[PDB]
Amino acid sequence: SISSRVKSKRIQLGLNQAELAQKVGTTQQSIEQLENGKTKRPRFLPELASALGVSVDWLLNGT
């Protein structure tokens, strides 16, 4: 799912949650909630994809 895919990519890029939050322009807590599967469709999906160097499709579907 998106939480495992987000974690996986930030690690590959050498980013901790705080760093990813600042790159996306959101709160640390928003990042935590996405990684813990609490939020599946954040408002910042396009910015998340860009910071992770991935497509939005990949994040959401895994294809």
Q: How far apart are CA 40 and CA 57, in angstroms?
A: 13
**Exposed/middle/buried for residue 33 (C-beta within 10 Å: 0-12, 13-18, 19+):** middle
Elucidation method = X-ray
For the chain, domain boundaries: 1-63
Instruction: Provide the CATH topology of domain 1-63.
Output: 434 Repressor (Amino-terminal Domain) (1.10.260)
| DSSP structure string for the chain | -HHHHHHHHHHHHT--HHHHHHHHTS-HHHHHHHHTTS-SS-TTHHHHHHHTT--HHHHHH--
